Specification:
By secondary structure, the chain is mainly alpha-helical. It has one domain. Helices cover 64% and strands 0% of the residues. The protein contains 7 helices and no strands. α1 packs antiparallel against α5. It is globular, with a radius of gyration of 14 Å. The structure holds ligand 5W2. Ligand 5W2 binds next to α6 and α7. It is found in: Nucleus; Chromosome. This is Bromodomain-containing protein 4. It comes from Homo sapiens. Belongs to the BET family.
């Protein structure tokens, strides 16, 4: 049951990586490369960076005890984007499209 919700989480993350969503999901695939992007204030603003590849590693390492812990890291990834960037920034629009994909499926988690 907890195992079953974690399988749902693995399926959700797999969809977030699917080519269908790549046009807006790709900025979230990997840790933000603050040095390559020139984001010299990023570590002053974001205390706990998170990205889809790290979430994938933690799922395989069994670091999430249940779906709520998984969901928290996904929401942290999005919240980090909304916190760091101006609300009209293009990457915020991309976060919103990816968060729609996540939330709609996360809401179908089995009881
Ligand atoms: C998860 C995440 C959260 N916040 C931000 N913020 C941010 C905010 C701004 C700049 C930016 O200013 N980049 C300059 C613009 C052109 N230059 C030649 C150097 C890089 C910036 F890169 C990132 N990014 C994230 N990921 C991310 C990963 C890779 C890339 Cl390439 C980008 N670039 S982006 O945001 O400009 C775009 C996706 C709309 C094209 C973003």
């Amino acid at each position: 049951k907890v195992s079953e919700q974690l399988k749902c989480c693995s399926g959700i993350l797999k969809e977030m990586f699917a080519k269908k969503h790549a046009a807006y999901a790709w900025p979230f695939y990997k840790p933000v490369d603050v040095e390559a992007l020139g984001l010299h204030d990023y570590c002053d603003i974001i205390k706990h960076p998170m990205d889809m590849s790290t979430i994938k590693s933690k799922l395989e390492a069994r670091e999430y005890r249940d779906a709520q812990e998984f969901g928290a890291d996904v929401r942290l990834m999005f919240s980090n984007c909304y916190k760091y960037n101006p609300p009209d920034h293009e990457v915020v629009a991309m976060a919103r499209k990816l968060q729609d994909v996540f939330e709609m499926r996360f809401a179908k988690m089995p009881d």
